[PDB]
Amino acid sequence: HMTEYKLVVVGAGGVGKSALTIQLIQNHFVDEYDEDSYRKQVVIDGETCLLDILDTDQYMRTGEGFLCVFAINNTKSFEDIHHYREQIKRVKDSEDVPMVLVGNKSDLPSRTVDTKQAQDLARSYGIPFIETSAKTRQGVDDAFYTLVREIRKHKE
Ligand SMILES: Nc1nc2c(ncn2[C@@H]2O[C@H](COP(=O)(O)OP(=O)(O)OP(=O)(O)O)[C@@H](O)[C@H]2O)c(=O)[nH]1
Ligand SMILES: [Mg+2]
């Protein structure tokens, strides 16, 4: 009676992958954290979805959609997005994998990646860009829901 979506959250260490997932799962922001996956049931456009979420193998090759996360005060995390996308394109053998680019930590003032750099990168890949804060919860639902919608756009 519900539809499963297998989602994988990738990106450089420290960008807030666990925090974003924990925000989705328990509606709270964890300052310090620690080895498995999470399930969440959520209605998205009138469909009961069971999200199966891996934070950071089986999931990489069977994942249906990817959140590619960098932090907006970590220029290197942003630069490394290319490596994460090439990896995904390799291990799914397609140039057209459901994916959302997420720029996390928007609450922080120390901002070294501009919204234009990020908009440019996402436009080049043909994917949505969503800005988030795991701390304030801004954008978190939006990122996961938009990923579900990209998966649907691609396959039944
Ligand atoms: N201010 C702020 N801090 C955040 C945010 N997201 C995560 N952090 C902090 O950044 C640090 C790293 O967050 P994690 O979720 O552990 O990062 P991760 O990407 O899962 O790191 P790995 O699991 O090592 O790959 C932690 O101290 C978090 O509290 C955010 O949106 N805003
Ligand atoms: Mg993590």
Curated annotation (Swiss-Prot):
Reaction(s) this enzyme catalyzes, per UniProt: GTP + H2O = GDP + phosphate + H(+)
Primary enzyme class: hydrolase
Effect of G13S: In GASC and JMML; also found in lung carcinoma; somatic mutation
Record note on what altering G13V does: In GASC; also found in lung carcinoma, pancreatic carcinoma and colon cancer; also found in metastatic colorectal cancer; somatic mutation; it is constitutively activated and stimulates transcription activation of tumor suppressor genes in non-transformed fibroblasts; promotes GTP binding
N-acetylmethionine modification, residue list: M2
Effect noted on mutating G14R: In pylocytic astrocytoma; somatic mutation; increase activation of the Ras pathway
GO CC, one annotated term: mitochondrial outer membrane
Sites bearing N-acetylthreonine, chain numbering: T3
Effect of G13C: In lung carcinoma; somatic mutation; also found in metastatic colorectal cancer
One GO term (biological process): response to glucocorticoid
Post-translational events: Acetylation at Lys-92 prevents interaction with guanine nucleotide exchange factors (GEFs). Lysine-depalmitoylation by SIRT2 promotes its localization to endomembranes in endocytic pathways.
Topological relation to the membrane, as annotated: Lipid-anchor
Disease listed for this protein: Leukemia, acute myelogenous: A subtype of acute leukemia, a cancer of the white blood cells. AML is a malignant disease of bone marrow characterized by maturational arrest of hematopoietic precursors at an early stage of development. Clonal expansion of myeloid blasts occurs in bone marrow, blood, and other tissue. Myelogenous leukemias develop from changes in cells that normally produce neutrophils, basophils, eosinophils and monocytes.
UniProt family annotation: Belongs to the small GTPase superfamily. Ras family.
Functional summary from the UniProt entry: Ras proteins bind GDP/GTP and possess intrinsic GTPase activity. Plays an important role in the regulation of cell proliferation. Plays a role in promoting oncogenic events by inducing transcriptional silencing of tumor suppressor genes (TSGs) in colorectal cancer (CRC) cells in a ZNF304-dependent manner.
Protein name: GTPase KRas
Organism, scientific name: Homo sapiens
